[PDB]
Design a protein around this ligand. Structure first.
Ligand SMILES: CCCCCCCC/C=C\CCCCCCCC(=O)O
Ligand SMILES: CCCCCCCC/C=C\CCCCCCCC(=O)O
Ligand SMILES: CCCCCCCC/C=C\CCCCCCCC(=O)O
Ligand SMILES: CCCCCCCC/C=C\CCCCCCCC(=O)O
Ligand SMILES: CCCCCCCC/C=C\CCCCCCCC(=O)O
Ligand SMILES: CCCCCCCC/C=C\CCCCCCCC(=O)O
Ligand SMILES: CCCCCCCC/C=C\CCCCCCCC(=O)O
Ligand SMILES: CCCCCCCC/C=C\CCCCCCCC(=O)O
Ligand SMILES: CCCCCCCC/C=C\CCCCCCCC(=O)O
Ligand SMILES: CCCCCCCC/C=C\CCCCCCCC(=O)O
Ligand SMILES: CCCCCCCC/C=C\CCCCCCCC(=O)O
Ligand SMILES: CCCCCCCC/C=C\CCCCCCCC(=O)O
Ligand SMILES: CCCCCCCC/C=C\CCCCCCCC(=O)O
Ligand SMILES: CCCCCCCC/C=C\CCCCCCCC(=O)O
Ligand SMILES: CCCCCCCC/C=C\CCCCCCCC(=O)O
Ligand SMILES: CCCCCCCC/C=C\CCCCCCCC(=O)O
Ligand SMILES: CCCCCCCCCCCCCCCCCCCC
Ligand SMILES: CCCCCCCCCCCCCCCCCCCC
Ligand SMILES: CCCCCCCCCCCCCCCCCCCC
Ligand SMILES: CCCCCCCCCCCCCCCCCCCC
Ligand SMILES: CCCCCCCCCCCCCCCCCCCC
Ligand SMILES: CCCCCCCCCCCCCCCCCCCC
Ligand SMILES: CCCCCCCCCCCCCCCCCCCC
Ligand SMILES: CCCCCCCCCCCCCCCCCCCC
Ligand SMILES: CCCCCCCCCCCCCCCCCCCC
Ligand SMILES: CCCCCCCCCCCCCCCCCCCC
Ligand SMILES: CCCCCCCCCCCCCCCCCCCC
Ligand SMILES: CCCCCCCCCCCCCCCCCCCC
Ligand SMILES: CCCCCCCCCCCCCCCCCCCC
Ligand SMILES: CCCCCCCCCCCCCCCCCCCC
Ligand SMILES: CCCCCCCCCCCCCCCCCCCC
Ligand code: NA
Lengths: 223, 223, 220
């Protein structure tokens, strides 16, 4: 079942990528860069999850580590944060320093998750905690300085940014929650339960987010 | 013999790098970035192939030799070659870094599928190989489609040079996955020594040959 | 003791990062990018050294592989910081900056490979890293210093100071490497551990204190 779920996921990622490509052909004022980002996220996640489906992107450590998830997130999650940052900056001057601040925090976050998964006892929760601290700083930037950039770009953009910021932030907190509850953490949730959460969540983050984000930006277009 | 061939290759890479450096000292209107790219490609490839020569950049897997240092080489050298080709198309005009990074992304993915395919067995090997070939087809479509149209937007003389270097590189591109599939990593029709010689001779034309043709053609545009 | 030293180091890195963040809040004409670089260097090094403290970032000769994970990010960022100092108040030369980044990343990789190697092979890789370092030094005191000079007497004086500071530390690393267990094995493991605790405090925090203070002073 776990293999089949991952095959299904990869197919949905492909469909998402194709939808974003078709959107890119009639871009409605959204720069090509934002369509490229929207396409890379699901295609990369799709490839990573395909490796799990084929029984390659996981190994035994007694307990199963789905290491292909970290290979996925270390690329897909910084790209999602870049997408969010470019949305805030839409129609205005770019702040690439702030964008790369978020990328740096996020990459660190995913690495702490991988190391935590390879760790046991207190060490696991030290790494997990450092990842959570990274996430809190990302949230502070998202609803603080990055939102202030969004506000500087007008009422309609700021309203859209706030919506996609809440959307992504809601999903963000779900990942480390599922991680902690599942076999990698406290082991309250069964393996199959965790697998389903990390199949369903990413559909909303790797395709859902970009549908909402691109549609909202496209709606701002005159003509 | 395999060791000696790799020592020889690394020395040729060094000579190529030095030639591009000397060219960079009298640049004839070619930006320093294009000389840097031209130098990094052979130096990186040279280092990777030196590791094979020293007997480090290979190991035994499925009773076959995996020259993993080739993938370490290509994952850096091949995206840089595509960047060189993309900057040639954009020479004397506005840059399209979105298209450039599209090619970089496709190419890095392509090399990764090759590494995973080499580590795989049976149907799984050819699933990864196939995804890499799909990436290459999209690269070729970009190269002779939208990227060539950028070249044409920069005038007859530039477009003529771009088309020449695009054909040169494209011809070499298709050879790599052909040799891969025919050799021990794939169907095993071609002998290991034959594959070794192909992956010594081809790269001399791509790591040095391409940049000689590319830089000379761009330099000729100078008055 | 080795564990305790690494915990202490990671705490100093955290304090350094916090200081640079506080400085960033009243930037005095220094772009946010230079404060971001100053913060990433110690935080990344701190994380890597924490992994050694926890007994994870090494395998047993003992290879402290977490040092290479540290340097492959921290050292290119230090060179970027130095390059941006040279270019302060003038046009950026990102080609020269990325030239230094490329040389430096290659340099650290040769160090890791050399550490995993034995005999003549080890010293071939070590030698390639040294050649990379020499080219970095030639760029630092040649073309990069020329950019600094083009940006006025006060900037050039500050650049020259931080260039000598960083260059002094640079040459120490491959010297200690060669003398220690990774190389000739003349220096004891504990001695090498202390050197690679003390040196980095001066490079990951010291350099940016001197660098940022000097640039901030140009606001007046
Ligand atoms: C794109 C991401 C790729 C996932 C990595 C694939 C796993 C490596 C193969 C392991 C194996 O064959 O046992
Ligand atoms: C990974 C490490 C991150 C450190 C990198 C430095 C930030 C570079 C951003 C360049 C900023 C350009 C101008 C701007 O838009 O702010
Ligand atoms: C691989 C790269 C890893 C990067 C290093 C990991 C930790 C990085 C964190 C630095 C980012 C902190 C920036 C906070 C201040 C932002 C602001 O001024 O608004
Ligand atoms: C500041 C916030 C950083 C810390 C955040 C999360 C802490 C959660 C870790 C607790 C799990 C311990 C369980 C256990 O030890 O069995
Ligand atoms: C613990 C959970 C913390 C997460 C959310 C913090 C929200 C921050 C709100 C804006 C503060 C940033 C600012 O205004 O500069
Ligand atoms: C992990 C693998 C990552 C490899 C990526 C490295 C290769 C990418 C190079 C991109 C170069 C693009 C630089 C644009 C030059 C702009 C200019 O010349 O003005
Ligand atoms: C520059 C890139 C060069 C990379 C080469 C990696 C070679 C690593 C060899 C490790 C030693 C293996 C062995 O001798 O068993
Ligand atoms: C396989 C993973 C590789 C992913 C690396 C690249 C992902 C693409 C992300 C961003 C694209 C950058 C576009 C830069 C826009 C500059 C403006 C322009 O000239 O078009
Ligand atoms: C594979 C062969 C490449 C085909 C090139 C088609 C050109 C596309 C276009 O004109 O947009
Ligand atoms: C022209 C192609 C060169 C290679 C042809 C000979 C193949 C040798 C072999 O079967 O191993
Ligand atoms: C060296 C390997 C390949 C040779 C490539 C072409 C030879 C030089 C031609 C120069 C030119 O076309 O101006
Ligand atoms: C963030 C920087 C961290 C990098 C080093 C992490 C090393 C983790 C290895 C764990 C292996 C083990 O538990 O034995
Ligand atoms: C391997 C990873 C290497 C990471 C180090 C690279 C970062 C270089 C940062 C250069 C930023 C320059 C732009 C600054 C500005 O324009 O303000
Ligand atoms: C690995 C790195 C290989 C070299 C990659 C190329 C990056 C060059 C960046 C070009 C910036 C042009 C603008 C400038 O020179 O200021
Ligand atoms: C250690 C020895 C290595 C070299 C130090 C710097 C060499 C001289 C710098 C370049 C001088 C110049 O270009 O004018
Ligand atoms: C400072 C004091 C120096 C302590 C002694 C140094 C020993 C180096 C040789 C191992
Ligand atoms: C012009 C449109 C280009 C589309 C290419 C999309 C890039 C995807 C990269 C693959 C990553 C997996
Ligand atoms: C053992 C499988 C390794 C696959 C390589 C995936 C790409 C590197 C990690 C993300 C960058
Ligand atoms: C450790 C793996 C490295 C992760 C990096 C993945 C790429 C994310 C960087 C996003 C950059 C896009 C922003 C460009 C601005 C467009 C104008
Ligand atoms: C990932 C570990 C980071 C440790 C802290 C780094 C130093 C302080 C960073 C604070 C950033 C605050 C950004 C929001 C400003 C309002
Ligand atoms: C034992 C099976 C239970 C599966 C539960 C899946 C829950 C998915 C909800 C997504 C958030
Ligand atoms: C997979 C979740 C998709 C959510 C998209 C919502 C519909 C578009 C809103 C505009
Ligand atoms: C992978 C190896 C990286 C090496 C980069 C090549 C750098 C050579 C020096 C660049 C030339 C700049 C000199 C300007 C004066
Ligand atoms: C090995 C067996 C794999 C069977 C499923 C292949 C599906 C490929 C989709 C791309
Ligand atoms: C690497 C696998 C990619 C899967 C499909 C990606 C989405 C479609 C890409 C279309 C190619 C664009 C070429 C431009 C033609 C003009
Ligand atoms: C003018 C139309 C462009 C199509 C070019 C055909 C594809 C080139 C073949 C590449 C293989 C060598
Ligand atoms: C005017 C000089 C101010 C120096 C402040 C030093 C702060 C050091 C931060 C922690 C380093 C360990
Ligand atoms: C047997 C001992 C050989 C040691 C080699 C050390 C020399 C490496 C190059 C030094 C550059 C100055
Ligand atoms: C501590 C190492 C210092 C190396 C540089 C010394 C030579 C610099 C030459 C500059 C020319 C003026
Ligand atoms: C490995 C330890 C060697 C002792 C120190 C060598 C010189 C470095 C500067 C102090
Ligand atoms: C110069 C950089 C600092 C040097 C510190 C040397 C400490 C050596 C202590 C050795 C004690 C016995 C192993
Ligand atoms: Na070019």
């Amino acid at each position: 079942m776990i293999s089949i779920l991952h095959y299904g996921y990869s197919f949905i990622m492909l469909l998402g990528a194709l939808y974003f490509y078709l959107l890119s052909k009639d871009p409605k004022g959204v720069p090509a860069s934002e369509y490229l980002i929207a396409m890379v996220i699901p295609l990369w996640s799709g490839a990573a999850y395909l490796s799990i489906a084929l029984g390659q992107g996981l190994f035994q450590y007694d307990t199963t580590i789905y290491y292909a998830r970290y290979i996925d997130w270390v690329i897909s999650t910084p790209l999602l944060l870049a997408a969010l940052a470019l949305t805030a900056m839409f129609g205005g001057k770019k702040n690439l320093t702030l964008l790369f601040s978020l990328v740096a925090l996020d990459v660190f976050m995913i690495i702490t998750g991988f190391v935590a998964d390879l760790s046991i006892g207190t060490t696991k929760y030290i790494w997990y905690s450092l990842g959570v601290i990274a996430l809190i700083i990302i949230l502070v930037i998202t609803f603080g300085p990055l939102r202030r950039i969004a506000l500087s770009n007008g009422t309609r953009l700021a309203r859209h940014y706030t919506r996609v910021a809440i959307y992504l932030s809601a999903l963000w907190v779900c990942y480390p929650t599922a991680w902690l509850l599942g076999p990698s953490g406290l082991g309250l949730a069964q393996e199959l339960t965790e697998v389903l959460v990390f199949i369903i969540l990413p559909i909303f983050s790797k395709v859902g987010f970009s549908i909402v984000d691109l549609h909202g930006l496209r709606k701002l277009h005159q003509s």
